[PDB]
Design a protein around this ligand. Structure first.
Ligand SMILES: CCCCCCCC/C=C\CCCCCCCC(=O)OC[C@H](O)CO
Ligand SMILES: CCCCCCCC/C=C\CCCCCCCC(=O)OC[C@H](O)CO
Ligand SMILES: N[C@@H](CCC(=O)N[C@@H](CS)C(=O)NCC(=O)O)C(=O)O
Ligand SMILES: N[C@@H](CCC(=O)N[C@@H](CS)C(=O)NCC(=O)O)C(=O)O
Lengths: 130, 139, 139
């Protein structure tokens, strides 16, 4: 069983594709011609927000699966849901103003350290039984 | 094991990505762009942006590829996987010659990514209704 | 029986987060206010190095697991550790001067390449097991 992990993962991949879509409409609304990524200030906020998310994505996925596999799938899955929401706050907050990114950011960084902690314990815990 | 095809596509796609990184490295030398800068030459700037768009989407493609292959069909996911790799080849070399000649390869690889997403969502769903609610769409 | 892969994977994730933190400390120290990523030579080097690392991360993870799953987990694990070390040289090297990034860059692309090779052999050998040929005949 990894079905809960599997659901959360497909969920998050849809959010990441959505964010990429938001940048695509921002190019048109603020007339920023590829390959440029600068000019309009709110475009730079949208672009930078989507970039920070897309960077951290594989890191969320790995910690998510290690925790779910070596600690508990249901608990990890729940944390996973919380992360997806924190990233929803981060993205939309930042789009409006750089200081509105702060809540969603702290939320998503909290979950991530926890996931790391849980995955690290279960992996450790698992090897002392051997 | 019953993932041997997925593993093969993954390794192929990973080689294409390292290949894209090599071109950026060679473009840096051809147009004399001093690191860590990434602007100055229009032809460099198109190559950099192209590799950037590919390298962003890579983990999304991988998750979508494996979820399709595990919960829907390894052979169908595997075949789409190859075409996606092909589309990104068009996108990259397309964008490199002109900003607007990236579009065919762009629509191809994204169309495919969505189909794979669809399949992954169905199979995961089907497996979920059969494992916590005892309902299979089997008929 | 993927316990070693899991461990290396958690180490590398911590490494990546530590790098992200450096960019954050650099933002405060050289006054680069978000969403800007230019404006200070020392920041731009730290930023660019961290960007190269996080982009290459999923490529390393896939390659690590295909090798570890289809060839040998202990050997893939060891290569994984040396790669994490190469990225350590690369990042701090680049932070001091763009031209001190080259050793760690070479070590880690060397490793990635070895991992890509081993995974390809292992998948091949493993594919022949549904053709019933196993090169346990070379063992
Ligand atoms: C000494 C620690 C062992 C490092 C090897 C395993 C790497 C794993 C941890 C962090 C990634 C890189 C950051 C390392 C943080 C400790 C080293 C440091 O802070 O400075 C290094 C020096 O300034 C320039 O070589
Ligand atoms: C094509 C050649 C296949 C042989 C690869 C091989 O030697 O397999 C290694 C084995 O998987 C691990 O010890
Ligand atoms: N700081 C430069 C050089 C970094 C580096 O070590 N390798 C570069 C080119 S020399 C690379 O392979 N980049 C792939 C990419 O980021 O596009 C950059 O990121 O463009
Ligand atoms: N992966 C991040 C790590 C650095 C980081 O955490 N930056 C914080 C600054 S506290 C951020 O969210 N910056 C907003 C932005 O990049 O636009 C990056 O390279 O930007």
């Amino acid at each position: 069983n990894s079905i809960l992990l599997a659901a959360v993962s497909i969920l998050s991949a849809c959010q990441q594709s959505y964010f990429a879509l938001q940048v695509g409409k921002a190019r048109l609304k603020y007339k920023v011609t590829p390959p440029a990524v600068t000019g309009s200030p709110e475009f730079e906020r949208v672009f930078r927000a989507q970039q920070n998310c897309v960077e951290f994505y594989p890191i969320f996925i790995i910690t998510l699966w290690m925790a779910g596999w070596y600690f508990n799938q249901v608990f990890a899955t729940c944390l996973g849901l919380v992360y997806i929401y924190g990233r929803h706050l981060y993205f939309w907050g930042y789009s409006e103003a750089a200081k509105k990114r702060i809540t969603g950011f702290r939320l998503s960084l909290g979950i991530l350290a926890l996931l790391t902690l849980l995955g690290a314990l279960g992996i450790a815990n698992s090897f002392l039984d051997e």
